[PDB]
Design an enzyme around this catalytic site. Structure first.
Site, PDB file in Angstrom:
ATOM      1  N   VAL A  67       0.834  -1.202   0.000  1.00 51.16           N
ATOM      2  CA  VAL A  67       0.000   0.000   0.000  1.00 51.16           C
ATOM      3  C   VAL A  67       0.866   1.247   0.000  1.00 51.16           C
ATOM      4  O   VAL A  67       1.770   1.382   0.830  1.00 51.16           O
ATOM      5  CB  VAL A  67      -1.080  -0.021   1.130  1.00 51.16           C
ATOM      6  CG1 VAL A  67      -0.463   0.030   2.533  1.00 51.16           C
ATOM      7  CG2 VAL A  67      -2.127   1.073   0.937  1.00 51.16           C
ATOM      8  N   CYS A  68       0.615   2.139  -0.961  1.00 52.88           N
ATOM      9  CA  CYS A  68       1.382   3.374  -1.101  1.00 52.88           C
ATOM     10  C   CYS A  68       0.498   4.557  -1.480  1.00 52.88           C
ATOM     11  O   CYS A  68      -0.615   4.380  -1.998  1.00 52.88           O
ATOM     12  CB  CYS A  68       2.518   3.188  -2.103  1.00 52.88           C
ATOM     13  SG  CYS A  68       1.957   2.856  -3.794  1.00 52.88           S
ATOM     14  N   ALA A  69       1.020   5.765  -1.240  1.00 53.26           N
ATOM     15  CA  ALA A  69       0.353   7.007  -1.588  1.00 53.26           C
ATOM     16  C   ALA A  69       0.353   7.158  -3.116  1.00 53.26           C
ATOM     17  O   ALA A  69       1.361   6.864  -3.761  1.00 53.26           O
ATOM     18  CB  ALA A  69       1.074   8.181  -0.934  1.00 53.26           C
ATOM     19  N   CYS A 102       4.591  -1.020  -5.040  1.00 52.59           N
ATOM     20  CA  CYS A 102       3.340  -0.347  -5.194  1.00 52.59           C
ATOM     21  C   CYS A 102       3.503   0.899  -6.096  1.00 52.59           C
ATOM     22  O   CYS A 102       2.665   1.118  -6.956  1.00 52.59           O
ATOM     23  CB  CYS A 102       2.836   0.000  -3.794  1.00 52.59           C
ATOM     24  SG  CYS A 102       1.291   0.930  -3.757  1.00 52.59           S
TER      25      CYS A 102
END
Lengths: 174, 166
Positions: A67-69, A102
């Site tokens: 999970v990443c921005a 990600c």
């Protein structure tokens, strides 16, 4: 003397704590030092292999995440879509753990590179974390090089979970 | 230097794997939570040093897991799964994940361990990783079993390693 004694040694923040980073991040105008890092197939990739192209060196403590921005991914995508440009996402994660990044997987002109071989890059680019639980990892930084390996943008992020100035890095390429 | 192989391709390994009767050299490696873990912290307990080029895999043999589980289940025995993978990638290991007295350790720090234990790959595509080996230590860090596999792809002799602990 031809050096600055009043420029404090590089320090970054993690979990509200000051963390020392060895060396000095190359600044605008500096000639980037040649380096050799490890690609996803375990082959050695030299900075010289990208001769003539602009390079975005997107340096991270770790890119091993599920999970990443969106901003992380968006910057890599936009930079990689620019003409005569390569994005090199660099970290101390082994190539086996970088492929699930990600913010780099399936992006045109975005290559992941590992510090597996070798750590001379970390000192040469002033990104080696030397204290606390993160010691042995790279700090968070962005270094943009023109077609002749001259630094056109440089940023060592003050807080490790903070995003660099992506708009400024892209502006340097326009 | 020792010579091993990866799918038949020659691989050079630096140092000397400790042999039976040797006193294993102390080390400090990095645990899952990024804390430092020293070999001396397991004083009195037997230790299985299960050394891999990588434990970052979503699919592994049942034998790898059974060995770690069985050795870890034995009283006064800890299994140390060691590799050059970062701690962030060592939690996915089927062979270690959710097993009692089985802990992962990374060479992110304390990398001189690799040369000290004769598992350091120094040249070629696998350079910077450890070779495949199993070193079994008693309570006083004396080697009771050691095996550096000639073919990295093959498993060590798990039955022999367990027999040494009996």
């Amino acid at each position: 003397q031809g050096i600055d004694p009043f420029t404090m040694t590089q320090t970054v923040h993690f979990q509200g704590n000051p963390v020392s980073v060895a060396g000095k991040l190359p600044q605008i105008g500096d000639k980037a030092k040649d380096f050799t890092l490890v690609a996803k197939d375990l082959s050695d990739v030299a900075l010289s292999s990208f001769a003539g192209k602009r390079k975005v060196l997107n340096i991270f403590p770790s890119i091993d995440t599920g999970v990443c921005a969106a901003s992380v991914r968006k910057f890599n995508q936009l930079a990689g879509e620019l003409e005569n440009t390569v994005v090199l996402c660099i970290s101390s994660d082994l190539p086996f753990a970088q492929s699930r990044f990600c913010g780099a997987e399936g992006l045109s002109n975005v290559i992941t590179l590992s510090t597996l071989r070798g750590a001379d890059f970390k000192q040469a680019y002033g990104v080696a974390i030397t204290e606390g639980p993160l010691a042995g990892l790279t700090a968070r930084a962005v270094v943009v090089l023109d077609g002749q390996d001259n630094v056109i943008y440089s940023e060592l992020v003050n807080e490790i979970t903070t995003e660099p100035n992506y708009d400024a890095a892209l502006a340097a390429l326009k």
